[PDB]
Amino acid sequence: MPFEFENLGMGIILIKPKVFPDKRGFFLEVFKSEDFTKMRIPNVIQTNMSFSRKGVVRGLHYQRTPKEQGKIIFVPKGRILDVAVDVRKSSPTFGKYVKAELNEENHYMLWIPPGFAHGFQALEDSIVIYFITHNEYSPPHERCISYSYIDWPIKEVIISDKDLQCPSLEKAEVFD
C-alpha cells in the first residue's frame, strides 16, 4: 500500500499513490520499481513532459512493433481527460477505449501497455509527465489514429498539424 492498483480493462491500470500533506505542502512517491514490477509494469526507459493550454488535444499516438511503448501518464498540474484506444486488430476489444480524468487533485496515474493509442484533452492548463517503458522515441515507428475518434468535452480544440492528418481508425496502420 504505497499504491493501489485498479484494472480498467484490456491491460489498462489506474494507479493511486499516497499523498502526505503537512505545513510545507505535500509529498508522494509517484513510481517505485518493486511495486510496479509486481503489477507487471517494466522499467522506465524515457521520461517526457508536455505543457498543454486548456482545450489542447494531443493524440492518439503509438509506436509500432518492434518499437512499441508502454506509458504511465501522470498530471502534477491541471486536469486532463486521458484516453487509451485498443488498436490491436486481433484483440476482442479492437476499437474499444478507456477514459480517465487525471489531475493534480487526485495525482492518479494510468498505465497503458503496448498495443494502445494514447491521447488526452487538457481540461485546464496542464503539465503531463509520461513515463515511457519498452522502447525509446523512434520516429520511423510512430503512428497515430485521429483524435476525432473520441468525443472530447472542450469545443475550442487546439491541435497540431501532425495530429490533424492522423488517419481514422479503419484506415490506420495498427497493431496485431
Added chain:
Amino acid sequence: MPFEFENLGMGIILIKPKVFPDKRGFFLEVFKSEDFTKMRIPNVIQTNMSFSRKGVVRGLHYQRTPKEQGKIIFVPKGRILDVAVDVRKSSPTFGKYVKAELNEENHYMLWIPPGFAHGFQALEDSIVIYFITHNEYSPPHERCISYSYIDWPIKEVIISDKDLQCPSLEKAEVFD
C-alpha cells in the same frame, strides 16, 4: 542534443533539456536512457514528487551504503535553490557543496550521484520531481545533515520537525 550536460564540480552535473514551444504549449524529453548511460547516470527505479510553499527548506538527505541513491532533480513548476554537499569522509572535497537554481523557465536538472546530501529551498511555491537511481526508499538507511550547514536565500525558513533533528555535518554518520 537533445541534452547538453554541464559539469558543476565533484561529479555533479547540470542537464539542460531542449524545450519545443508551440501554440499548444511546450514539449520536452526529460530523460532518455541511452543518453544518461553515456554520462554514467544509471536506470531510474523510483520517482517522487513534492509541493513546497515559498521559503520551505527540505534536506539535507542521503541514504547510506548499501542502499545509496543517485538523484536527478527537476522543477516543472516554480523555482528552487538546489544544493548537494559532498558527504564522503575520504573525499578531498568533503563538506564542499554545489548550489544551482532549477526552475520552470530553465527546465534544468541536477544529477547528484551517491555520496552527497541533497536539500533545497523553494524560492517560490514549487513542484519538485526527484528521479531516483541505484536504490529505492529505505527508512533504516536514511541519514541527513542539518539544513543550517547551508546559508539559505530566504530568512523565513519553513522546516519539518524531523529535518530539525538532522545532526551537524561534524556529528553526522557519513559516507566512507
